[PDB]
Amino acid sequence: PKFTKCRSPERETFSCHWTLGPIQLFYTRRNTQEWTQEWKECPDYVSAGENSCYFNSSFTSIWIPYCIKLTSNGGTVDEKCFSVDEIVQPDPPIALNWTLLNGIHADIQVRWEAPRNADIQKGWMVLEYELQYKEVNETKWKMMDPILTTSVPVYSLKVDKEYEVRVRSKQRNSGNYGEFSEVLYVTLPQMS
């Protein structure tokens, strides 16, 4: 066994998933001056799914280091130390959609929604998005510089081709990039 990964979707809670016998997860976090708190076994083995551990808002704090260990009947199978702020990785944007901005080419405007769990409205989170699109038959994607907003025009799309768009988000200056949204297929109007 080995840690598959630990992540915090909205900087308020996190969970860890892993790939002998029954594997247990122990954790401790530096509370106060020193790591004085004894190891406590995973508080929730169901919530974040099979082979995971979910730490609700009650066990989640930021800027404080944590250490987790996967244990088996043979001893420690894996260890990992981090502070929640390093593991932020937001969920995908939702409600993706487009609309003509305004005949071989066409300009469109794509818009989505921020992941519902991200407190953007109150300041606890600031995301930036990265949009990608391509013709449905090609294999590479055209990236687009990151944006602070939830609408973005895509210019000069050829009307005679169908496109795909997926947007992904990340907490500014923190963490890595999260999952991509479900793709948005775009078939433009063609004037014969």
Binding site: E12, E34, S57, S61, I62, W63, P65, C67, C81, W124
Partner: peptide, 28 residues
Amino acid sequence: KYSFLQNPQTSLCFSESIPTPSNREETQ
């Protein structure tokens, strides 16, 4: 990194003597 983290004498920051909130509830 881990041994750095598990040893406060090396990882505990000077600034940490200033009492700041540690989670969203506390902060807001």
